[PDB]
Design a protein around this nucleic acid. Sequence first.
RNA 1: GGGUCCAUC
RNA 2: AACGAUGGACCCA
Length: 1203
Amino acid sequence: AEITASLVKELRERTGAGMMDCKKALTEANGDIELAIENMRKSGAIKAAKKAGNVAADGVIKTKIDGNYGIILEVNCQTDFVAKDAGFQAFADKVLDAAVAGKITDVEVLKAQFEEERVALVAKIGENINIRRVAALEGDVLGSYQHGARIGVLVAAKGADEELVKHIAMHVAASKPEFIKPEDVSAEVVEKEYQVQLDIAMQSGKPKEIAEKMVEGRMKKFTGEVSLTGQPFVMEPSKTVGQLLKEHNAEVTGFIRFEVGEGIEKVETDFAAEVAAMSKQSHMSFERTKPHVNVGTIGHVDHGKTTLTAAITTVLAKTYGGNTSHVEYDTPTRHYAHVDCPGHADYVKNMITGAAQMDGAILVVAATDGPMPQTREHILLGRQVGVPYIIVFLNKCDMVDDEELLELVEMEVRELLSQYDFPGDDTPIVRGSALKALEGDAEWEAKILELAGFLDSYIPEPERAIDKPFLLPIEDVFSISGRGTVVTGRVERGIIKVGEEVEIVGIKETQKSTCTGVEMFRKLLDEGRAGENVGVLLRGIKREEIERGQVLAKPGTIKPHTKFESEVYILSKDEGGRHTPFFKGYRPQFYFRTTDVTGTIELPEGVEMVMPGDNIKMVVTLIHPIAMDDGLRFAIREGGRTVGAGVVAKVLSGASSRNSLSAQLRRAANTRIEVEGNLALSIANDLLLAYGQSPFNSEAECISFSPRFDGTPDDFRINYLKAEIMSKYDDFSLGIDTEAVAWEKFLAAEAECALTNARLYRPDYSEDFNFSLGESCIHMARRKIAKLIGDVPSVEGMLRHCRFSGGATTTNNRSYGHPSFKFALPQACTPRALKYVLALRASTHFDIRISDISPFNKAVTVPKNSKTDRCIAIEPGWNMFFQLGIGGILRDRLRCWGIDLNDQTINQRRAHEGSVTNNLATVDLSAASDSISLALCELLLPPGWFEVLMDLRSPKGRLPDGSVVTYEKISSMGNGYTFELESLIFASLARSVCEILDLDSSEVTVYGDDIILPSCAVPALREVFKYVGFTTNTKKTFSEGPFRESCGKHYYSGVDVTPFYIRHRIVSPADLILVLNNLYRWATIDGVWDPRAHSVYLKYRKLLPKQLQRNTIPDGYGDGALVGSVLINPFAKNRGWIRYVPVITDHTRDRERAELGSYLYDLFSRCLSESNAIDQLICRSNPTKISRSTGKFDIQYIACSSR
RNA sequence: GGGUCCAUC
RNA sequence: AACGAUGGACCCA
Ligand SMILES: Nc1nc2c(ncn2[C@@H]2O[C@H](COP(=O)(O)OP(=O)(O)OP(=O)(O)O)C[C@H]2O)c(=O)[nH]1
Ligand SMILES: [Ca+2]
Ligand SMILES: [Ca+2]
């Protein structure tokens, strides 16, 4: 020991101060029980003195109302855990009561009346408690709402009853309005705001009263939103609170809402790197299949878990070997991931969301203090989250020179433990110190070894997935002539062997059957094992007897249920979730392994509203059974959006939309807007007029107008719209205009490759004299290409990227384009392509067959603009299959040149930058890919690659003429690698051009033929391009001036100047809606109209059937309704707290799919996968359904918010 | 992913 | 009867 202190428990059994603040203030009181008590009193304020050195951004809010007088209280602390703590409740419940009767309002007044009790309950807790700010409200008939400790509100009404103020209090808590009336806002806070914004807009170049009226209508909205009056009522958002009051002859005298920790900052805590630095000072001085075990540290702010995780890392490293911010360490036998539990709600969230499943907690308590009040709450979190085991580390024992005392604290913890139904008598308790273990001290050092030994020993090994009873969530069901019925999915757990009997359980009466077989794409199989994608064949059962959503389990293993208790987390706005609260009758979709299912919920007693971000518990009853174990995770969904995650707790026992409306809308949708003349042109012209420009004299001027590249941005913007707007209209009368043009272009590119092909195979200028930029970039580019690409397309590469995709082939018309049809119907293939097919056919047991063997593709024509079509070519099915393989690998390799062909947004932003700085150029080639000759590829690519390109292309073309071409270009548009090959060729040359000029290659950025490099490089790029057989399009290439374009964004001195196109004769209401919405999005700034354009919009909105004039959707939801305000939409039905708007959809009819083909396509897909708050992964990917568009329109109801 | 629709290369 | 690619919305689930 050190001193004579064996019954200090009496000194602590009334102070809860500590075994080293009791054993200590007792050696300076010579042993006087009632004497020490006082030495600690007046000394307990000096600990609370350095206490205020800890940011305390958690706590509670409280509210009290004297039938007519109300008060709202805010009392802070450091963590969730103390805020739920019984003692912290009593202090602030008193400071609340004793602020109601003694009506206080002066904050620092109620503070000092509660300072000596504040140090009595701050020495006992160990956290900076501090009554932050109080306030109070008085009114005629006032009311309050509170959810949990986090948000409290006081509302003052007049002419309102009990419910009304309750509801308005709830709304105030959900929508936090800064003001009661729009008219309240500082009549000069907005004055400066309208004066700053008025210029911002005047800058675009828009005339006084344009920026004026926009800024006005803007700010009219800005205010209504931050104001009770002009906020859509939370319990029926179709009307505002403003309107809600007026129907009850009521008014709000005012309101107050505090939120715990508002305005604090609370510096973020990164635990994972926390230990890195903690270990920093100390950093100086097959068996890849170990079980992974999840542990977490939990305890008082800094009893030392702070440092103990460090100590575990060092000491475990020093001795043995070496997601979401987690330390991890190793044991001779196991692997551990370790998380800190800094907060109760923070943790419960991660446990539901599945971001932190704990196999065992380690509860850290420093013996210097012993257990604390809030340690009750730490063990309680463990109880509530169901952590199976808790191990205890007694920390800071170096500062306890009396072992008799350790046994005292160890005994307390053993008792709190048992109070919460944990095995307190039998739980491992290590007595040690991390303080002196990370700093090398063999004594306290092996104590960490002792604890680790208990992670290995006491926390049992987590059951391996392969060890659990078999289960496969069913994704799809297939009838296969001769084979029988087969289900596909990923085996979730266990093994299934052929012959074994299986149960199929879920949506309908559970059935049984027997596993005939197991197969993948390549092999056929004896068993399917956990984590494997397979199809499983069944005996007897029919395809119509099975359903996606069911599972396939070892019989009896799992049962179907409909009702259950869960822990769910509702996502916040900032997490892509709901942005509005729900209430009693929430009715969403519950997504289980692989399917959505409907269900109603019941909230617990005393909760009436859930807001985004909430950790609600709820009882969910489903519309029909589905197989569920205990601890099954699900997603909460609203029409495809995930708005919540949940896990099932205890499985229980079990026990409006508009049809004429939809009909009215459908008849409306299938009507034809009927007008005299060219309606598109009338619209374009009325718009030109409303902006003060001359209209289009004739159909001919629509396609032959040139913009001026000067003027204010405002004037260029409309001027450029005029130039572009009608430029792709497919329905002009006057024009000897045909696809004859496309074919001439197409013939012209070929002739051009003929020349370049001749010229480029003759790199001999009759002598070793003359040097050229062209020859030089090719040599330079070649060498770079070879380093990026290899000598040849890897095997892995091909097997990772070949696949079928999409539309027509030489053998299939568009209506048979689905991949499953490419596997069913036999595909054509090229003589040189044949060996690829054979190698494919050698890799599976499935039938891979060839309709024909032939060197032709089909040159056809597609729409492009008012002056010309585009000739493309339809490939042979199997050549495609292989063309996408190389296309996919070039796509990967290009990432190393910082070229990212999945993201056109890089080119858009660099085009924007370019128009501001003039340092970047946007370049365009005249017939990009048709001009890429065989000769150019041959001396740019490794031989290996060139050969494979030559196998895979189609060498000849059959034109609609009946006539032929033998391809001079390397490949036509339609070929599955043309786009990635042109991207490569273009980048390589441009990059080489950068070098030859001492520019940085990384300034080169390419998407197809959309090229961006530094402006300086352009004249040289132009020359290299000329040399290799390209023609740069001067008209669409910009190395100077205010203007840039890349990937469909157009900028002028930095302003978005992108236009919209009217492409077709407008004839259906959906046509007109498209046009009106495109006008909307072009002339609207954040919902606010440019008035010049609004006048045109309103005039043509009148041509729609009336109901369609008012059927509005928000932006971001397609074009089956007009974009506008969904809160005004008379057709919007709210069902179970979710909004549904009806939209026009193309009316379809179901078709029959090819069963063997669809099966094949499924398996082939799963083969592809294998070889290549964060819970988007609770979902799958879907079956194959075929359909045909009739030409009619349907009306579909869809969920939408305002996100 | 596949379709439909919207931008695009 | 219209090819290949990207991103978005709905729908497929
Ligand atoms: N298969 C296919 N490829 C396309 C299509 N549009 C563009 N591309 C690819 O993007 C590049 C060309 O874009 P565009 O600029 O519109 O066509 P272009 O052939 O170069 O002719 P131009 O500049 O004169 O209009 C090359 C081409 O492979 C298309 O509709 N289908
Ligand atoms: Ca081009
Ligand atoms: Ca371009």
